[PDB]
Amino acid sequence: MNVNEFSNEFDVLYNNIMSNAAPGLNEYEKSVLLTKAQEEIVKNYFEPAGNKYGKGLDDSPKRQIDFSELIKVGEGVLNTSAPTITFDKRAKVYDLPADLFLVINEAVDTNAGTKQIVPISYSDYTRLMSRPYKEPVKYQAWRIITTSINNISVELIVNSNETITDYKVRYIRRPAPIITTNLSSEYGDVTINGVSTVSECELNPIIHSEILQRAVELAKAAYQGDLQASVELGQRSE
Amino acid sequence: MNVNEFSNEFDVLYNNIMSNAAPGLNEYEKSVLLTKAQEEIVKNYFEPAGNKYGKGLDDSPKRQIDFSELIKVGEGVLNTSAPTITFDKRAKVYDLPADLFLVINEAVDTNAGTKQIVPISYSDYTRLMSRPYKEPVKYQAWRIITTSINNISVELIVNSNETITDYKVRYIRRPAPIITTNLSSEYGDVTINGVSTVSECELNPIIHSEILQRAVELAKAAYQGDLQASVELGQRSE
Amino acid sequence: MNVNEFSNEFDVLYNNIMSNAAPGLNEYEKSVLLTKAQEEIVKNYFEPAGNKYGKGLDDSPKRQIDFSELIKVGEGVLNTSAPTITFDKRAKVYDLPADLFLVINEAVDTNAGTKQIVPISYSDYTRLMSRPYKEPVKYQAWRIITTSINNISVELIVNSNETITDYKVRYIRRPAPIITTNLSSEYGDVTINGVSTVSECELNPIIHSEILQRAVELAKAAYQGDLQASVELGQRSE
Amino acid sequence: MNVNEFSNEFDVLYNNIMSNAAPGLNEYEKSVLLTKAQEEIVKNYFEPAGNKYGKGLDDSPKRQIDFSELIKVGEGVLNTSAPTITFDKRAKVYDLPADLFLVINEAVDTNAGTKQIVPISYSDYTRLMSRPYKEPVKYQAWRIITTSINNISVELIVNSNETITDYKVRYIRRPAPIITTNLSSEYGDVTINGVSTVSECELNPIIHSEILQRAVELAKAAYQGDLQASVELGQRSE
């Protein structure tokens, strides 16, 4: 549903049918609300407890198709460009892609075969390094985030005498903003996420209606403007 | 029932009987609300938790006959047109049809016979690639969504020394919009999902009354225009 | 109860006894409401959870007599007229009758005797085709809906080395509309479901009173016209 | 109406339908009364509470056409010639146009961007200068009037770290006098506002009737000589 339709049905659902019509929204306001609804819906549908169904990323066909056009596969770049201080003497630092929203699968290709990366918590790190062995299980590797600047930097811990060749990350791409019109203006160029040009919703058309409905709900909550509406609809930011 | 009957009965149910009759809706507004109701009804009826009966796609004769006119069978196109970075070294990339709404059944015909595709979750992917074997069961194949642009791209994982001949996908076709009248205008051509011409409801007449009722409910909720109505009737967008 | 009486007692129950009489309804409005009530009552009484009793199609004598004058027996036409792509290499495509509302019994007459058709779900299809045999039980056959255009197209899967001779479907016919008067007019011919002429209620007279009562309830809900009435009586569309 | 029409038609209204029945006004007196009447009309139709409709400058199409030929756009000139003392540390003194009657819109073009000027009262200045930050909002600038000599001088308090490059003022131009004859011909050195020659009305013809009627009322009151009439029609002088 290209952005002109986003604006047109936004008007239709917002004010064109209201009994006491509210002032129509500017295109910047509609773009901001649509982008906010996009992020809110993505976070709602990624986590099962964020929506009424209780279903997450791959808990039904609908969720799979929802995040289908947002999934991306990239590689981590070895961070030997500059020195650094790792928390572990035996961890190799890798930089994840910049346009990363959420990681759902990671894998490392070593000389000793491919191994699934298990992101270990700070409590599991302390528990596991109190043990005599302190290495992953046969077909897995460990991961902990390290000092990150401008992008997520990642420490990979593999078994001894293993060299990493590739480090693939299957992640959810950061959604691009929904901008209806060229936001360029003589009085000042405004941006949604650093882009002023027209930006289509690059997700599957299945959730475009949900994004529009959430945008309308946010618009009406802003219209009322009391604390109750803001807190009630702010619970779904998540 | 054809588009004329949708519009006429929409007027009848909306404002021709109500005491303090409200302004009649424009045909663009009626078409918008009918299309939104169509998508909402489809999403409610696919998921058991989305409707009051607790019944999903195939949980009763009515639910079968509801989507009977929306089911379609196609084939995935092998994505060797251009190079790409697969998350799994032994996965063949396939492109699904553009007009895909939900996948309900997939199957792949290999040299070793037909094999049912099981869409494995990311947590199930991590669990399964931690085992020594890392291959599907005898009569199945595995599947994960990969980098998708403009249409869903799919990674198929089969057993070793197996070649894929075809990849059939039983999916639900994307519903076409319901447009009452030719939306062509001298002041600007407006579209619902990229089409301005008249578009009939391409689903079974069993749910035409259902779509009309949902459209009327959405129309009256928009008429009320308060945050309450939008929030409570957005719960059914799903 | 022929349609003149439908209109006369509709008036009597709607406005002729009211203290502050509402405007009388047009014959088109009454026809639309009666047809809507007809479909709503059929769907109420087919599914047990749709009515207060909790009784479905054949759960009491009343329901049997209710759907008695709506049941029909027809045959499926082999769809070798044109080529197609079946989801199963070994399924024969058959086209169901056009005036089909709900299927309650299906059967196929093969050279190896008659067999009851079991409509298998998309989950049962995946479960059953993961098994070594992948054929029906002795005296049954499987069924899944395929690409359908203008009428439900059906795939029949029988055991190997079995040829289908007949395919009988015992279904519930689509109800004809209730039209009181010839809706032909000089200002434009209106239709309920594509027919303008007088149309009697072709169901058993047992549910005519229920259809009239539901029509009156819909009329009064439309008269009030608030969102509450529309949503409350829209739950019974089902 | 040319000046000759204002004089001739004053006598169809003041002088008892040009009957020489009322006292008889010279052309200098008629010019004086017309000038006073136009000033009164401008002041009354500007303030909503000053007229009979409760409508101000831009509150109806008639008011928009009334002041259409007075609205002027002019730039302010930096008052760097005189090194006076400003009440605010970061105030740049600007001189306004000499033919200024009422200001209605002011804007300042800074290096950061254009900023709408808010004419801030002496109470709001003390209120907003009792706070931590003490700067305008991101899209506005303040303005207070300062030591003025035979002109209008305004302090532009724009946010620190910003420089003013322009200052546009949209205002109501001071109306020119209405004079119906060369005053020097018969009256020695009398001027209305410094002009001794024929001066036409610089206003839209829509309010010429209003101005003439007000002049007639003022003449009749000034000649009836009652204190009550003078004080009663003195109410509308503002």
Numbering used by the authors:
A (entry chain U), B (entry chain E), C (entry chain U), D (entry chain F): 1 to 238
The authors write:
Virus ΦcrAss001 (Kehishuvirus primarius) was the first representative of this order to be isolated in pure culture from human faecal samples. The virion possesses a short non-contractile tail extending approximately 44 nm from an icosahedral capsid.
The portal protein’s clip domain interacts with the tail barrel, which extends approximately 23 nm towards the muzzle protein complex at the tip of the tail. The barrel is composed of five stacked dodecameric ‘rings’, termed ring 1 (R1, at the portal end) to ring 5 (R5, at the muzzle end). These structures are formed by four paralogous ring proteins: R1, R2 and R3 are encoded by genes gp43, gp40 and gp35, respectively, whereas R4 and R5 are both encoded by gp34. The tail barrel and fibre docking hubs are stabilized by disulfide bonds, notably between fibre docking hub proteins, the fibre docking hub and ring proteins, and between R1 and R2. Unexpectedly, well-defined density at the inner surface of R1 and R2 of the tail barrel corresponds to 12 copies of an additional α-helical segment of the same protein, gp45 (residues 214–245). This region corresponds to 6 copies of a 14-residue segment containing an α-helix.
